[PDB]
Amino acid sequence: GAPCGRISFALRYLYGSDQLVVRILQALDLPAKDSNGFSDPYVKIYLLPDRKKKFQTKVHRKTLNPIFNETFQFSVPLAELAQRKLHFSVYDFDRFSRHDLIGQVVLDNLLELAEQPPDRPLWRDILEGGSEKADLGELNFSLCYLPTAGLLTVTIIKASNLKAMDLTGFSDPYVKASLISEGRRLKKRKTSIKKNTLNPTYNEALVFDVAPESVENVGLSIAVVDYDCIGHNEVIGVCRVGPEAADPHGREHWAEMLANPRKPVEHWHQLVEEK
């Protein structure tokens, strides 16, 4: 994590009252999440051990260099600073979509910093900002194409654990049927649309008209988009079943996408493919 700017804070350990004061000062060069070029940032703040006593800075609109200047206290046992870290989270802020996380920072040696004083601005880097990592769900379907009239069966049964893209905690799933590399994107196929649910169940098929030899493309990449009326539809995840040596499960799933003219091609794949 680097393009994720830097944030300025100060911290003192008030004595007598045994509280740990913390001041969020400001941040520089935060990334530009929103499209207009800016970001509406704000930061969560909690004492790592107990991940449930958080604090929240006001949000600042359109600016990659917000000036917080907000102080929060944490009544804590003097010597308790031992087993205790400090977590900072900076998220973009949105009104309906899920809040993007820009970066976080961890203040390991909480003790030393007890140093001094209120005015002790001590910059730190905003980390975490590269590629994938976590989950997104995993969809299940069954491929089945017959050489006869040439019908590549792409029946989508269900999927589960889908990522919530709404703040409500849900998503309005549906899936797109497509291919890869060569293109053939001039031939897509969308499923139904199931409201508020992280484990849709379609039991719907996708009628295709492909040919024999043409099956050496090993191409058919599908994705789980989230139908949003407010903003525009976003892809929650994708799979591929194609020449993606990154997912053997699929390419094999392709080879065995014959032999037994239906069903078998079952055994869902992951969706941790953010395309």
Residue 139 structure tokens: 């969809």
Q: How far does Cα 127 stand from its chain's mean position?
A: 16
Where do the H-state alpha helices sit in the chain? 248-255
Smaller CB separation from Mg ion, 24 or 165: 165
Residue number with CB closer to Mg ion (95 or 133)? 95
Q: If we measure between CA atoms, which residue out of 13, 15, 11, 14 comes closest to residue 23?
A: 11
Please name the amino acid found at residue 258. L
Contacting residue, 1, 19, 21, 34, with Mg ion by CB under 5 A: 34
Strand partners, 225: 174, 235
Taking CB under 5 A as the rule, does residue 234 contact Mg ion? Answer: no
Identified binder of Mg ion from the candidate list 8, 71, 97, 160, rule CB under 5 A:
97
8 Å CB contact between 168 and 155: no
Number of residues that bind Mg ion (CB under 5 A): 6
Which is closer to Mg ion, CB of 228 or CB of 244? 228
Nearer to Mg ion, 38 or 208 (CB): 38
Structure tokens at 36: 């207009």
Q: Is 197 in the site for Mg ion (CB under 5 A)?
A: no
Question: Rounded distance, CA 225 to CA 172, Å?
Answer: 8
Which range touches Mg ion (CB under 5 A), out of 33-41, 74-82, 107-115, 210-218?
33-41
Out of 31, 72, 85, 94, the only residue in the binding site for Mg ion (CB under 5 A) is: 94
Residues forming the site for Mg ion (CB under 5 A): 34, 40, 94, 97, 166, 228
